[PDB]
Amino acid sequence: PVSRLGDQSFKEDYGLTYAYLAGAMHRGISSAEMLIRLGKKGMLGFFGTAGLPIREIEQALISIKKTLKNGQPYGMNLRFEPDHQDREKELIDLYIKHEVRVIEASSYFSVSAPLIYYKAHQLKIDKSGRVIPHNRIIAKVSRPEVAAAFLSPPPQSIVKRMCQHGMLTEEQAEWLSRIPAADDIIIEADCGEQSSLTAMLPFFVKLRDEMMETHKYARKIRIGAAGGIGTPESAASAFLMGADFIMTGSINQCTVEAETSGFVKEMLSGTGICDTAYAPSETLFEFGTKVQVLKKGTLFPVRANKLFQIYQQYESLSEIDEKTKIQLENDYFNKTFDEIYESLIEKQPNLAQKAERNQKYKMLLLFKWYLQRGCLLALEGQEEQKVNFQVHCGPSLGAFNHWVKGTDLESWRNRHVDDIGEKLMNETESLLRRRLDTL
Amino acid sequence: RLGDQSFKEDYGLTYAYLAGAMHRGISSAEMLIRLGKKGMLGFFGTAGLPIREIEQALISIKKTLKNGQPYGMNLRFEPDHQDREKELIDLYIKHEVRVIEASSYFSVSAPLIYYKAHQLKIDKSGRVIPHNRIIAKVSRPEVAAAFLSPPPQSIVKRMCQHGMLTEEQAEWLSRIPAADDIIIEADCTEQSSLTAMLPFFVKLRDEMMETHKYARKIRIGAAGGIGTPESAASAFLMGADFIMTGSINQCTVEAETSGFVKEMLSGTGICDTAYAPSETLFEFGTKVQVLKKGTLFPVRANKLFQIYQQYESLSEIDEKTKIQLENDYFNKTFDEIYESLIEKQPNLAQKAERNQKYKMLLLFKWYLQRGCLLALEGQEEQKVNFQVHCGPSLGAFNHWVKGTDLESWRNRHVDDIGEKLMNETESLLRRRLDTLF
Ligand SMILES: Cc1cc2nc3c(=O)[nH]c(=O)nc-3n(C[C@H](O)[C@H](O)[C@H](O)COP(=O)(O)O)c2cc1C
Ligand SMILES: Cc1cc2nc3c(=O)[nH]c(=O)nc-3n(C[C@H](O)[C@H](O)[C@H](O)COP(=O)(O)O)c2cc1C
């Protein structure tokens, strides 16, 4: 029960017993059951909203609220998508409707009006003249300028715009300028971008300290650490560099709680440190955005990377040589270009106006569907098409597996998300105490 | 004071701090000299240099370091050219080099076994005492396993049949590991994470220790990402017996690289590096971390790899893109640059007319070589094509030294930056015991 790792103030404000968060996994892989189990142990999970329709997100919220009815910690992810700010306002209104008091903001480059509106809800000032937030944000960042934005107060450009539209009140807009754009930050390194936490984490920790003496807020902003945390040594290293809390993703996919196919959870059980690869990202494909995926038992990383090299080498979709055109339609997708396009015009016929106009966009959405298809096939059951499975994963799982090798935890069916976190947290504190003295 | 006590004694160090090699002599003789006087171990950058420049550097270091001061030599592995390896080990034995940094090896080789065998002996107590030592630089489990395990008896038995080893040296070599020590290298040419890798290799060393039961313990080093007191503190906390630093050392008075590059390097940040294709194993998608701030080299080098996988022939490149390579990337035509590579070897030009892929492969490999040479040169304004190897560690170091007099590369001395790094790492570990608890 000791749990002396991380910042004491962070645990109080979020209602935790351990300064341990479990990051989101898309399409509900970070399930309602996952959060429920973390909430009962005083740990903070984030529901995987990305990809899901509002129907499934709304259902997951009420499901959690009726089990977690004693102030237990739970949160929701909110992934930034550029042209879909219509859904951002909907999700924040839904989060305010279902009393979600913490969100994980990811893929943001700047703070937005819906994020400002979220923090503003039930915002108030105490008798002492200090701004007390009701709803909190933990921005997951990988770059200095983004971290800087979220550590700095919200842009007046947006706060003033919001008052003209009645979304904020002058009392709220003044209180928002006296607090950071996000309540806390997470530094992401090798998530399932590709920079090391060892070179990054000391910088962001100093940047937080710089922003603290500059803006002079009431309470401290806490810096989290994510990407590569799968063992007591990994977490101990993060905490030693100055992390106020830790965060894990890759491990949590290999548990009873996570919503992914059982074969995938079994493939995940036997992965090693060198069984991952950098594939192109679905959301920001054309810009060379990478995604770390599973390599053991799947051709998806090679096949996905091959689709990117052809997008850059050819401008039109029809300019692909006959020799290579046939292999994509037969074994990658298992469907021709025209029948794939016929299904994609069915949903959103609007985009077809752009596909007819621009031959690059026509090509782009076809290859983006291979990445979607791969993710969906991994989530499905009773399917022996493991060659196209896209399973987001990092070396941290491989490191975790190696650490648990020999114990009863080798099988995923004995891995409970709360007990793996509890063990990780307790061995980390045991190692720190030990290693520091054994100098 | 920090690290493994036995490692410092066997290599004659005051600090368990090594400085990795930097190709084409960038890890200069002067650097090794300055590190040797502070009780730190530097490895001379032999890669790319001809034997005359390596031989000259050796005698230069011996003329200055004769008080048993620590210095070593790098040795990379090239399968196409084994004679270069043989000659270098004979040169290292000629000039009394007692420690070597083995890189890009997948298996221990006859020249490495011959190196450890020189002046090898057994004490009165019946324990094998090595004269010449190897520190293998590995990034993979199977390679680390090989070097932790004793030398393959088949290479050792074949070496006896050719008179390279004796009957008693061959027995002594089987009772000791293939390399005296290991360095786990991550991120720096690989995509590996020191946080996920280091705990494994430390356990693998322990497994190999109880298995083979050698006399003396094998020490595990840590390289890739160490540019600050908390990076090193993290490595030492994960079980590193010593740490190694490369990117930071390139930005010091002692390193042999152009002053403009040292100025470029002084202002780099954590996000100012990029993964470009490697000179060696280019076709296989092997990556190399390079400088991004001020150079177009990472983009231009990566574009050449896309062109190689796209087409089959060098002449099949469309006219629009064919012209920009011959004028912006380099200042020679495809036929003209082929003439530049006549001097090195005519027999490889035979294979080029035979295979049209090999023809374009060696052309794109020269862009990478040209980029490296242009960075080393002075009076340079060809910054656009400079290939400067670097990692986020330099950016992290710069941010740590921001505000102090060490901000300029002229105020930075390789021994004092290492001394400070190690002094503050010690301080950080000791003080955080009281801080977090
Ligand atoms: C299956 C999977 C799905 C993920 N999906 C998302 C996502 O939708 N949103 C997000 O913010 N992070 C996502 N992540 C990243 C994690 O939340 C976490 O920050 C990261 O994996 C930490 O790195 P680690 O895996 O090395 O511990 C995902 C990770 C995995 C393994
Ligand atoms: C300029 C430069 C050149 C390098 N050349 C070599 C080389 O020839 N051989 C080698 O084994 N390592 C080489 N390295 C790797 C370093 O010796 C070292 O392993 C590593 O860079 C340490 O990590 P750091 O870059 O994060 O400080 C090079 C690194 C740099 C910065």
PDB file of N, CA, C and O in Angstrom, chain A residues 85 110-120 123 149 152-182:
ATOM      1  N   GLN A  85     -13.502  18.960 -36.421  1.00  0.00           N
ATOM      2  CA  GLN A  85     -13.728  19.748 -35.190  1.00  0.00           C
ATOM      3  C   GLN A  85     -15.229  19.764 -34.822  1.00  0.00           C
ATOM      4  O   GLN A  85     -15.589  20.201 -33.725  1.00  0.00           O
ATOM      5  N   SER A 110      -1.801  22.445 -30.875  1.00  0.00           N
ATOM      6  CA  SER A 110      -2.210  23.678 -30.216  1.00  0.00           C
ATOM      7  C   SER A 110      -3.539  23.439 -29.473  1.00  0.00           C
ATOM      8  O   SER A 110      -4.305  22.531 -29.824  1.00  0.00           O
ATOM      9  N   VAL A 111      -3.798  24.251 -28.434  1.00  0.00           N
ATOM     10  CA  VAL A 111      -5.035  24.119 -27.674  1.00  0.00           C
ATOM     11  C   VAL A 111      -6.178  24.702 -28.501  1.00  0.00           C
ATOM     12  O   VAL A 111      -6.016  25.732 -29.152  1.00  0.00           O
ATOM     13  N   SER A 112      -7.314  24.003 -28.513  1.00  0.00           N
ATOM     14  CA  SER A 112      -8.485  24.345 -29.317  1.00  0.00           C
ATOM     15  C   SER A 112      -9.677  24.814 -28.468  1.00  0.00           C
ATOM     16  O   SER A 112      -9.715  24.596 -27.254  1.00  0.00           O
ATOM     17  N   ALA A 113     -10.656  25.458 -29.132  1.00  0.00           N
ATOM     18  CA  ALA A 113     -11.846  25.967 -28.470  1.00  0.00           C
ATOM     19  C   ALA A 113     -12.595  24.868 -27.699  1.00  0.00           C
ATOM     20  O   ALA A 113     -12.892  25.073 -26.521  1.00  0.00           O
ATOM     21  N   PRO A 114     -12.792  23.657 -28.252  1.00  0.00           N
ATOM     22  CA  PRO A 114     -13.450  22.604 -27.464  1.00  0.00           C
ATOM     23  C   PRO A 114     -12.682  22.193 -26.190  1.00  0.00           C
ATOM     24  O   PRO A 114     -13.313  21.928 -25.171  1.00  0.00           O
ATOM     25  N   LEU A 115     -11.342  22.197 -26.220  1.00  0.00           N
ATOM     26  CA  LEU A 115     -10.532  21.909 -25.027  1.00  0.00           C
ATOM     27  C   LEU A 115     -10.650  23.039 -24.002  1.00  0.00           C
ATOM     28  O   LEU A 115     -10.657  22.783 -22.801  1.00  0.00           O
ATOM     29  N   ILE A 116     -10.711  24.286 -24.470  1.00  0.00           N
ATOM     30  CA  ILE A 116     -10.876  25.436 -23.574  1.00  0.00           C
ATOM     31  C   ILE A 116     -12.271  25.375 -22.947  1.00  0.00           C
ATOM     32  O   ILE A 116     -12.406  25.625 -21.756  1.00  0.00           O
ATOM     33  N   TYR A 117     -13.295  25.029 -23.741  1.00  0.00           N
ATOM     34  CA  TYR A 117     -14.687  24.910 -23.270  1.00  0.00           C
ATOM     35  C   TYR A 117     -14.810  23.817 -22.212  1.00  0.00           C
ATOM     36  O   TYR A 117     -15.577  23.968 -21.271  1.00  0.00           O
ATOM     37  N   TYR A 118     -14.068  22.725 -22.363  1.00  0.00           N
ATOM     38  CA  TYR A 118     -14.065  21.613 -21.413  1.00  0.00           C
ATOM     39  C   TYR A 118     -13.522  22.043 -20.044  1.00  0.00           C
ATOM     40  O   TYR A 118     -14.173  21.778 -19.036  1.00  0.00           O
ATOM     41  N   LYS A 119     -12.349  22.711 -20.003  1.00  0.00           N
ATOM     42  CA  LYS A 119     -11.762  23.170 -18.736  1.00  0.00           C
ATOM     43  C   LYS A 119     -12.636  24.223 -18.062  1.00  0.00           C
ATOM     44  O   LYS A 119     -12.697  24.274 -16.829  1.00  0.00           O
ATOM     45  N   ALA A 120     -13.310  25.058 -18.872  1.00  0.00           N
ATOM     46  CA  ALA A 120     -14.170  26.146 -18.399  1.00  0.00           C
ATOM     47  C   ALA A 120     -15.410  25.659 -17.649  1.00  0.00           C
ATOM     48  O   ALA A 120     -15.876  26.355 -16.749  1.00  0.00           O
ATOM     49  N   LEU A 123     -15.745  25.807 -13.791  1.00  0.00           N
ATOM     50  CA  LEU A 123     -14.506  26.454 -13.362  1.00  0.00           C
ATOM     51  C   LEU A 123     -14.875  27.512 -12.314  1.00  0.00           C
ATOM     52  O   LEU A 123     -15.921  28.163 -12.430  1.00  0.00           O
ATOM     53  N   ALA A 149       3.164  25.159 -25.752  1.00  0.00           N
ATOM     54  CA  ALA A 149       1.805  25.655 -25.932  1.00  0.00           C
ATOM     55  C   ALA A 149       0.909  25.263 -24.783  1.00  0.00           C
ATOM     56  O   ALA A 149       0.240  26.110 -24.203  1.00  0.00           O
ATOM     57  N   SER A 152       1.921  26.916 -21.461  1.00  0.00           N
ATOM     58  CA  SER A 152       1.574  28.336 -21.525  1.00  0.00           C
ATOM     59  C   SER A 152       0.037  28.487 -21.393  1.00  0.00           C
ATOM     60  O   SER A 152      -0.681  27.542 -21.696  1.00  0.00           O
ATOM     61  N   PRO A 153      -0.510  29.654 -20.995  1.00  0.00           N
ATOM     62  CA  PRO A 153      -1.982  29.778 -20.904  1.00  0.00           C
ATOM     63  C   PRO A 153      -2.677  29.737 -22.267  1.00  0.00           C
ATOM     64  O   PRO A 153      -2.010  29.874 -23.297  1.00  0.00           O
ATOM     65  N   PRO A 154      -4.008  29.525 -22.306  1.00  0.00           N
ATOM     66  CA  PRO A 154      -4.684  29.425 -23.609  1.00  0.00           C
ATOM     67  C   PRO A 154      -4.588  30.709 -24.453  1.00  0.00           C
ATOM     68  O   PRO A 154      -4.631  31.812 -23.893  1.00  0.00           O
ATOM     69  N   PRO A 155      -4.429  30.603 -25.792  1.00  0.00           N
ATOM     70  CA  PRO A 155      -4.327  31.819 -26.611  1.00  0.00           C
ATOM     71  C   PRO A 155      -5.511  32.732 -26.436  1.00  0.00           C
ATOM     72  O   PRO A 155      -6.641  32.276 -26.541  1.00  0.00           O
ATOM     73  N   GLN A 156      -5.252  34.020 -26.237  1.00  0.00           N
ATOM     74  CA  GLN A 156      -6.324  34.999 -26.107  1.00  0.00           C
ATOM     75  C   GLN A 156      -7.126  35.098 -27.404  1.00  0.00           C
ATOM     76  O   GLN A 156      -8.343  35.257 -27.358  1.00  0.00           O
ATOM     77  N   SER A 157      -6.463  34.885 -28.545  1.00  0.00           N
ATOM     78  CA  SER A 157      -7.094  34.827 -29.869  1.00  0.00           C
ATOM     79  C   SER A 157      -8.348  33.929 -29.888  1.00  0.00           C
ATOM     80  O   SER A 157      -9.343  34.251 -30.541  1.00  0.00           O
ATOM     81  N   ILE A 158      -8.267  32.797 -29.186  1.00  0.00           N
ATOM     82  CA  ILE A 158      -9.332  31.796 -29.128  1.00  0.00           C
ATOM     83  C   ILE A 158     -10.288  32.084 -27.986  1.00  0.00           C
ATOM     84  O   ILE A 158     -11.492  31.913 -28.152  1.00  0.00           O
ATOM     85  N   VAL A 159      -9.765  32.516 -26.830  1.00  0.00           N
ATOM     86  CA  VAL A 159     -10.590  32.812 -25.654  1.00  0.00           C
ATOM     87  C   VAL A 159     -11.507  34.010 -25.923  1.00  0.00           C
ATOM     88  O   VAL A 159     -12.676  33.974 -25.529  1.00  0.00           O
ATOM     89  N   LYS A 160     -10.989  35.045 -26.617  1.00  0.00           N
ATOM     90  CA  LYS A 160     -11.785  36.231 -26.965  1.00  0.00           C
ATOM     91  C   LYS A 160     -12.848  35.862 -28.013  1.00  0.00           C
ATOM     92  O   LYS A 160     -14.012  36.233 -27.853  1.00  0.00           O
ATOM     93  N   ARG A 161     -12.468  35.060 -29.029  1.00  0.00           N
ATOM     94  CA  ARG A 161     -13.394  34.579 -30.068  1.00  0.00           C
ATOM     95  C   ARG A 161     -14.563  33.869 -29.411  1.00  0.00           C
ATOM     96  O   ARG A 161     -15.708  34.109 -29.783  1.00  0.00           O
ATOM     97  N   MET A 162     -14.251  32.999 -28.424  1.00  0.00           N
ATOM     98  CA  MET A 162     -15.230  32.191 -27.693  1.00  0.00           C
ATOM     99  C   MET A 162     -16.216  33.001 -26.881  1.00  0.00           C
ATOM    100  O   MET A 162     -17.354  32.563 -26.738  1.00  0.00           O
ATOM    101  N   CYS A 163     -15.802  34.167 -26.351  1.00  0.00           N
ATOM    102  CA  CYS A 163     -16.708  35.053 -25.607  1.00  0.00           C
ATOM    103  C   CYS A 163     -17.706  35.700 -26.550  1.00  0.00           C
ATOM    104  O   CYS A 163     -18.898  35.743 -26.225  1.00  0.00           O
ATOM    105  N   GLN A 164     -17.244  36.147 -27.746  1.00  0.00           N
ATOM    106  CA  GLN A 164     -18.125  36.727 -28.770  1.00  0.00           C
ATOM    107  C   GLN A 164     -19.232  35.773 -29.241  1.00  0.00           C
ATOM    108  O   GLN A 164     -20.243  36.226 -29.797  1.00  0.00           O
ATOM    109  N   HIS A 165     -19.027  34.473 -29.031  1.00  0.00           N
ATOM    110  CA  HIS A 165     -19.965  33.438 -29.397  1.00  0.00           C
ATOM    111  C   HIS A 165     -20.715  32.849 -28.204  1.00  0.00           C
ATOM    112  O   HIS A 165     -21.469  31.901 -28.384  1.00  0.00           O
ATOM    113  N   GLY A 166     -20.554  33.438 -27.019  1.00  0.00           N
ATOM    114  CA  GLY A 166     -21.223  33.001 -25.797  1.00  0.00           C
ATOM    115  C   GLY A 166     -20.776  31.672 -25.229  1.00  0.00           C
ATOM    116  O   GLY A 166     -21.426  31.173 -24.305  1.00  0.00           O
ATOM    117  N   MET A 167     -19.660  31.083 -25.751  1.00  0.00           N
ATOM    118  CA  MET A 167     -19.116  29.809 -25.272  1.00  0.00           C
ATOM    119  C   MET A 167     -18.395  29.987 -23.934  1.00  0.00           C
ATOM    120  O   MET A 167     -18.304  29.016 -23.179  1.00  0.00           O
ATOM    121  N   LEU A 168     -17.875  31.206 -23.642  1.00  0.00           N
ATOM    122  CA  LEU A 168     -17.253  31.556 -22.362  1.00  0.00           C
ATOM    123  C   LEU A 168     -17.813  32.864 -21.847  1.00  0.00           C
ATOM    124  O   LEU A 168     -18.340  33.678 -22.605  1.00  0.00           O
ATOM    125  N   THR A 169     -17.655  33.057 -20.547  1.00  0.00           N
ATOM    126  CA  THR A 169     -18.087  34.251 -19.841  1.00  0.00           C
ATOM    127  C   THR A 169     -16.819  34.979 -19.437  1.00  0.00           C
ATOM    128  O   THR A 169     -15.783  34.349 -19.247  1.00  0.00           O
ATOM    129  N   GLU A 170     -16.867  36.303 -19.373  1.00  0.00           N
ATOM    130  CA  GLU A 170     -15.689  37.102 -19.004  1.00  0.00           C
ATOM    131  C   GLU A 170     -15.024  36.655 -17.677  1.00  0.00           C
ATOM    132  O   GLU A 170     -13.801  36.744 -17.555  1.00  0.00           O
ATOM    133  N   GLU A 171     -15.816  36.144 -16.722  1.00  0.00           N
ATOM    134  CA  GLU A 171     -15.308  35.657 -15.439  1.00  0.00           C
ATOM    135  C   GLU A 171     -14.460  34.419 -15.669  1.00  0.00           C
ATOM    136  O   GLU A 171     -13.421  34.248 -15.046  1.00  0.00           O
ATOM    137  N   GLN A 172     -14.905  33.569 -16.602  1.00  0.00           N
ATOM    138  CA  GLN A 172     -14.226  32.326 -16.983  1.00  0.00           C
ATOM    139  C   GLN A 172     -12.991  32.595 -17.834  1.00  0.00           C
ATOM    140  O   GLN A 172     -11.948  31.994 -17.600  1.00  0.00           O
ATOM    141  N   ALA A 173     -13.107  33.489 -18.823  1.00  0.00           N
ATOM    142  CA  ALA A 173     -11.986  33.840 -19.708  1.00  0.00           C
ATOM    143  C   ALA A 173     -10.806  34.453 -18.948  1.00  0.00           C
ATOM    144  O   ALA A 173      -9.667  34.250 -19.362  1.00  0.00           O
ATOM    145  N   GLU A 174     -11.063  35.164 -17.833  1.00  0.00           N
ATOM    146  CA  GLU A 174      -9.986  35.744 -17.028  1.00  0.00           C
ATOM    147  C   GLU A 174      -9.342  34.615 -16.217  1.00  0.00           C
ATOM    148  O   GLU A 174      -8.114  34.531 -16.147  1.00  0.00           O
ATOM    149  N   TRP A 175     -10.170  33.718 -15.648  1.00  0.00           N
ATOM    150  CA  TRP A 175      -9.669  32.581 -14.875  1.00  0.00           C
ATOM    151  C   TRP A 175      -8.843  31.639 -15.749  1.00  0.00           C
ATOM    152  O   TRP A 175      -7.827  31.132 -15.281  1.00  0.00           O
ATOM    153  N   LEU A 176      -9.256  31.426 -17.015  1.00  0.00           N
ATOM    154  CA  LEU A 176      -8.527  30.556 -17.948  1.00  0.00           C
ATOM    155  C   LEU A 176      -7.134  31.117 -18.283  1.00  0.00           C
ATOM    156  O   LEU A 176      -6.189  30.341 -18.389  1.00  0.00           O
ATOM    157  N   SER A 177      -6.994  32.452 -18.399  1.00  0.00           N
ATOM    158  CA  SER A 177      -5.685  33.063 -18.673  1.00  0.00           C
ATOM    159  C   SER A 177      -4.695  32.899 -17.501  1.00  0.00           C
ATOM    160  O   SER A 177      -3.490  33.024 -17.717  1.00  0.00           O
ATOM    161  N   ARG A 178      -5.195  32.645 -16.274  1.00  0.00           N
ATOM    162  CA  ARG A 178      -4.362  32.470 -15.081  1.00  0.00           C
ATOM    163  C   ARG A 178      -3.972  31.003 -14.818  1.00  0.00           C
ATOM    164  O   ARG A 178      -3.388  30.713 -13.769  1.00  0.00           O
ATOM    165  N   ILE A 179      -4.303  30.077 -15.748  1.00  0.00           N
ATOM    166  CA  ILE A 179      -3.980  28.654 -15.635  1.00  0.00           C
ATOM    167  C   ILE A 179      -3.462  28.123 -16.979  1.00  0.00           C
ATOM    168  O   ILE A 179      -3.838  28.644 -18.032  1.00  0.00           O
ATOM    169  N   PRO A 180      -2.652  27.054 -16.981  1.00  0.00           N
ATOM    170  CA  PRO A 180      -2.150  26.529 -18.249  1.00  0.00           C
ATOM    171  C   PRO A 180      -3.235  25.930 -19.135  1.00  0.00           C
ATOM    172  O   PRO A 180      -4.265  25.483 -18.632  1.00  0.00           O
ATOM    173  N   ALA A 181      -2.988  25.919 -20.455  1.00  0.00           N
ATOM    174  CA  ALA A 181      -3.910  25.387 -21.456  1.00  0.00           C
ATOM    175  C   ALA A 181      -4.339  23.932 -21.163  1.00  0.00           C
ATOM    176  O   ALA A 181      -5.502  23.591 -21.375  1.00  0.00           O
ATOM    177  N   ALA A 182      -3.414  23.095 -20.637  1.00  0.00           N
ATOM    178  CA  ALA A 182      -3.705  21.738 -20.141  1.00  0.00           C
ATOM    179  C   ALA A 182      -3.257  21.708 -18.694  1.00  0.00           C
ATOM    180  O   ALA A 182      -2.271  22.357 -18.346  1.00  0.00           O
TER     181      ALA A 182
END
